[PDB]
Amino acid sequence: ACGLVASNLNLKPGECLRVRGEVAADAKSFLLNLGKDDNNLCLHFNPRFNAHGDVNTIVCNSKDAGAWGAEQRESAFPFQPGSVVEVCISFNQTDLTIKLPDGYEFKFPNRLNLEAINYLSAGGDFKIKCVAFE
Amino acid sequence: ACGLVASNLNLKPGECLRVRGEVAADAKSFLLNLGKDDNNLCLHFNPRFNAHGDVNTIVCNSKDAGAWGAEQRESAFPFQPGSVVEVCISFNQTDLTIKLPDGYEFKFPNRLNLEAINYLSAGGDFKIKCVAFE
Numbered sequence: 001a002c003g004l005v006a007s008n009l010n011l012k013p014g015e016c017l018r019v020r021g022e023v024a025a026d027a028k029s030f031l032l033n034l035g036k037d038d039n040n041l042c043l044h045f046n047p048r049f050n051a052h053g054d055v056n057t058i059v060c061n062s063k064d065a066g067a068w069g070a071e072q073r074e075s076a077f078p079f080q081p082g083s084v085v086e087v088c089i090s091f092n093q094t095d096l097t098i099k100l101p102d103g104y105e106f107k108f109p110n111r112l113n114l115e116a117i118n119y120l121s122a123g124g125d126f127k128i129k130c131v132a133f134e
Numbered sequence: 135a136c137g138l139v140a141s142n143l144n145l146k147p148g149e150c151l152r153v154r155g156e157v158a159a160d161a162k163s164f165l166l167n168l169g170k171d172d173n174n175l176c177l178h179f180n181p182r183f184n185a186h187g188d189v190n191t192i193v194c195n196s197k198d199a200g201a202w203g204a205e206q207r208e209s210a211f212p213f214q215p216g217s218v219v220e221v222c223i224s225f226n227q228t229d230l231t232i233k234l235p236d237g238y239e240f241k242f243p244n245r246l247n248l249e250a251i252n253y254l255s256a257g258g259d260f261k262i263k264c265v266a267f268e
């Protein structure tokens with residue numbers, strides 16, 4: 001299940017990517033990919049309601065030239081199926097900072113050392129309703 | 135025009151595409167492209183401040199299999215350079231409603247009889263700040 005694919009983003013460090021969308025009722029999981037292209041992502045944000053063995057766990061990873069990196073799992077899961085959830089990702093060369101709906105923040109290392117995000121992609125059981133550049 | 139490019143969308147009749155952006159200070163024109171891909175556009179929204187022999191005129195057109203169609207010029211030009219504009223677009227199989235700021239809104243025929251818009255792209259002296267699928 002793949003949703004929108006966005007290119008020519010040119011989100012530079014300091015800028016904030018605000019993505020709001022609707023989680024499906026039968027939501028197994030959903031994801032957001034940020035990087036330069038599909039085979040090179042600095043952030044594979046993947047909330048797992050019940051998927052790939054994870055129950056209510058956020059799986060984050062990088063992808064370098066097609067190879068997934070080491071996964072980082074977050075136990076904070078403020079998501080409910082069928083709800084409209086907003087997420088906010090601030091870019092930075094050192095790392096990425098994610099703002100969940102409740103105001104919970106956590107970092108993810110910027111492994112590819114990307115100085116600019118140009119690719120965005122959505123997937124899973126989610127419907128992007130808004131993308132805001134700040 | 136090459137700015138933001140969002141594909142694999144599935145904007146169907148009933149939803150509203152809301153785009154908000156910043157028009158440059160030295161703005162000659164900007165554009166929003168809607169269709170299946172770059173060679174099949176149901177709408178080419180090209181507000182022109184001073185470009186292609188057009189002074190403050192909105193040029194709309196379609197592109198079928200790479201070939202441009204007949205151009206439609208509008209009566210109102212509710213834009214100023216160095217300002218933030220927001221256009222709303224209602225999708226219908228026979229027409230497209232483009233609701234602009236200041237209460238102006240026109241209709242452009244859906245010459246391709248498109249039942250879903252899978253491609254959006256921006257260009258010109260426009261800076262996408264927000265895009266919504268409501």
Ligand SMILES: CC(=O)N[C@@H]1[C@@H](O)[C@H](O[C@@H]2O[C@H](CO[C@H]3O[C@H](CO)[C@@H](O)[C@H](O)[C@@H]3O[C@@H]3O[C@H](CO)[C@@H](O[C@@H]4O[C@H](CO)[C@H](O)[C@H](O)[C@H]4O)[C@H](O)[C@H]3NC(C)=O)[C@@H](O)[C@H](O[C@H]3O[C@H](CO)[C@@H](O)[C@H](O)[C@@H]3O[C@@H]3O[C@H](CO)[C@@H](O[C@@H]4O[C@H](CO)[C@H](O)[C@H](O)[C@H]4O)[C@H](O)[C@H]3NC(C)=O)[C@@H]2O)[C@@H](CO)O[C@H]1O
Nearest residue numbers: 165178180186187188193194195196202203204205206207
């Ligand atoms: C609604 C209406 O009536 N509007 C008109 C405007 O159209 C008009 O603009 C002038 O248009 C003249 C050309 O005619 C246009 O229309 C016909 C058909 O109607 C077309 O055949 C022609 O191509 C023009 O149409 C426009 O084409 C472009 C490109 O396809 C369209 O843009 C595209 O649109 C699609 C969307 O569908 C998409 O968005 C694309 O991205 C976009 O690019 C556009 O929409 C379309 N418009 C229309 C209404 O169809 C031009 O002659 C005139 O331009 C001259 O003058 C300006 C400055 O004022 C110059 O910037 C420009 O370069 C050009 O200069 C002239 O160049 C020629 C060639 O170099 C010179 O002649 C040469 O001179 C030599 C000697 O030195 C030799 O003699 C040689 O033989 C000779 O060829 C010429 O001297 C130059 N003139 C000058 C002054 O330098 C302008 O665009 C305006 C203004 O009149 O009036 C409105 O009423």
